Amino acid sequence: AGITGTWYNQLGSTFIVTAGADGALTGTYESAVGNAESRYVLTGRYDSAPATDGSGTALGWTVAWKNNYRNAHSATTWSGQYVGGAEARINTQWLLTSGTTEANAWKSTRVGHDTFTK
Amino acid sequence: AGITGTWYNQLGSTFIVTAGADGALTGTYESAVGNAESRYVLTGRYDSAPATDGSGTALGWTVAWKNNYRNAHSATTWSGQYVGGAEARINTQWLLTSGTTEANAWKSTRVGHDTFTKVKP
Amino acid sequence: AGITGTWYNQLGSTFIVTAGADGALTGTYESAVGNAESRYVLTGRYDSAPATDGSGTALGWTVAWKNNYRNAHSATTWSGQYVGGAEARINTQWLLTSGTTEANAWKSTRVGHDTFTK
Amino acid sequence: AGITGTWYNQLGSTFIVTAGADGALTGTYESAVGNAESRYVLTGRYDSAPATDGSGTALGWTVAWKNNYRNAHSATTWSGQYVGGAEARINTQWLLTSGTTEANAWKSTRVGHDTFTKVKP
Ligand SMILES: O=C(CCCC[C@@H]1SC[C@@H]2NC(=O)N[C@@H]21)Nc1ccc([N+](=O)[O-])cc1
Ligand SMILES: O=C(CCCC[C@@H]1SC[C@@H]2NC(=O)N[C@@H]21)Nc1ccc([N+](=O)[O-])cc1
Ligand SMILES: O=C(CCCC[C@@H]1SC[C@@H]2NC(=O)N[C@@H]21)Nc1ccc([N+](=O)[O-])cc1
Ligand SMILES: O=C(CCCC[C@@H]1SC[C@@H]2NC(=O)N[C@@H]21)Nc1ccc([N+](=O)[O-])cc1
């Protein structure tokens, strides 16, 4: 409900997900940069019973960059927390791993942080 | 994509996957360290159509540290590549984020790296 | 000159550094959160001859959390780029490693991203 | 703190340090991979007064990928702990950031992990 919705990060990406009962996140992702074309499938997990304190709700999803238009041969996992409020945000960090040959395995991962607004 | 199987990272945590022909991962995860105990559910995505050159297959998945045995208010995202051959290893980096308050948001994410293989206790 | 100065991140930390001729960064750091008390020494490296394009200047320093008031037994390395301008910023990401016993080695590192303003 | 020595990560890059009694590291770094060639300078900080329990000594250092041989417009920060014993290993994670334009800022940082030891070619 708080999490279930449609979001947007600073890069302009579109994040449409449904916060499951089981603690499942399901939806689609449309990236605004990189070799992304249109929506991609997306799946993750969230804390069904977050702290009662003020803590945010932890979560994280995974976009495998393959659909009918492009296959960038690589997945991104966003790990972060949701914070409800007057400024409902979803703050995260993410990991861009690329299939590569062991000789490039070292420069295989790209790292960063996306902040979503609703 | 020998991906569907039972793997083991160096912490000896068990990871059990099944890769659908669509690009989805499902299954469980049982850590050997941390506020964990028993199986936690896992949901992921992976490249159903990987490059045919040498390139390894890419993948990712999440485990919300909550189940019937415990709730650690946190989640981990594994991101890396499945690399096949004689010994099959799936190489990843990970982000473990615990839910927190403003004052702590800053130190909410821990970062690490896990290597998984088909055998070892 | 562009880099040499005194900065501030979103957490309120104070970053005072001098951009060396050699490509050396030197100065002090005063953190606003964690177990930091007062200034700590700091040392790093920067790109002496950055791209002529529009690219930012890459850099990165290291604060070892020990001074006369506290020793949090841990170092932080910030890796990022400087971007001059009307909104001169220094965007980075950092790694908080803690001395620990191999049994906690796994949860040894803490990750994040600081954005500095001048 | 056997820290001052000659180490080697699994990529077989050479790292040469000297730890001052103040908490500073100095020396060079010679990668075996990437837009690197020859020695690049390195500046770091480390715990001069480490915990006496078991805890490993923490450390960090930076290498701006520029010298007389090449300029890759990027820098790497290694962060981790020196862990002594029979075989001495210094365990780190790293952030390699290349300078870029707005449109690319988003993919400027690569992340990885390196393990260093006193011997191996
Ligand atoms: O494989 C990629 C696919 C597209 C990347 C989307 C990323 S997910 C993190 C960030 N947040 C967003 O909303 N969008 C970006 N593209 C790609 C891969 C490699 C290179 N490269 O230069 O190596 C360039 C683009
Ligand atoms: O309760 C959690 C979950 C347990 C973490 C297991 C980690 S997942 C990365 C690595 N790979 C594995 O197979 N096992 C380990 N962790 C947690 C929660 C809060 C805090 N905290 O500091 O507040 C620290 C850790
Ligand atoms: O060892 C630490 C020392 C202080 C941390 C300063 C960090 S550097 C990244 C970030 N940017 C800032 O400007 N300040 C913070 N503190 C510490 C260590 C462990 C825990 N812990 O709960 O485990 C709490 C505080
Ligand atoms: O030119 C650079 C520097 C070479 C990187 C060596 C890395 S440091 C982490 C690891 N540990 C080592 O000992 N060696 C490797 N890299 C660079 C610059 C630009 C891009 N780019 O994609 O634009 C990629 C890599």
Side-chain angles (χ1 to χ4, degrees), chain B residues 3-33:
Chain B
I3 301 187
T4 296
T6 277
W7 306 84
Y8 306 88
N9 61 27
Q10 60 311 304
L11 302 183
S13 284
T14 311
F15 164 45
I16 294 186
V17 243
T18 280
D22 48 349
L25 306 177
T26 59
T28 66
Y29 198 97
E30 200 199 295
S31 166
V33 309

Side-chain angles (χ1 to χ4, degrees), chain A residues 106, chain D residues 6-15 29-34 36 38 113-117 119-121:
Chain A
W106 57 278
Chain D
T6 277
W7 306 84
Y8 306 88
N9 61 27
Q10 60 311 304
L11 302 183
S13 284
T14 310
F15 164 45
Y29 198 97
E30 200 199 295
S31 166
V33 309
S38 196
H113 50 115
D114 279 1
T115 245
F116 303 74
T117 72
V119 116
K120 76 75 39 74

Side-chain angles (χ1 to χ4, degrees), chain C residues 29-44:
Chain C
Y29 201 112
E30 196 168 319
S31 179
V33 300
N35 199 56
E37 193 162 324
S38 184
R39 293 170 193 182
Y40 291 76
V41 187
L42 103 67
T43 191

Side-chain angles (χ1 to χ4, degrees), chain A residues 2-43:
Chain A
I3 287 173
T4 328
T6 293
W7 311 67
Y8 290 97
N9 60 26
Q10 68 303 325
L11 295 173
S13 275
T14 317
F15 171 51
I16 306 184
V17 58
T18 303
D22 31 20
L25 298 160
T26 304
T28 88
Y29 201 112
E30 196 168 319
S31 179
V33 300
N35 199 56
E37 193 162 324
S38 184
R39 293 170 193 182
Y40 291 76
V41 187
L42 103 67
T43 191

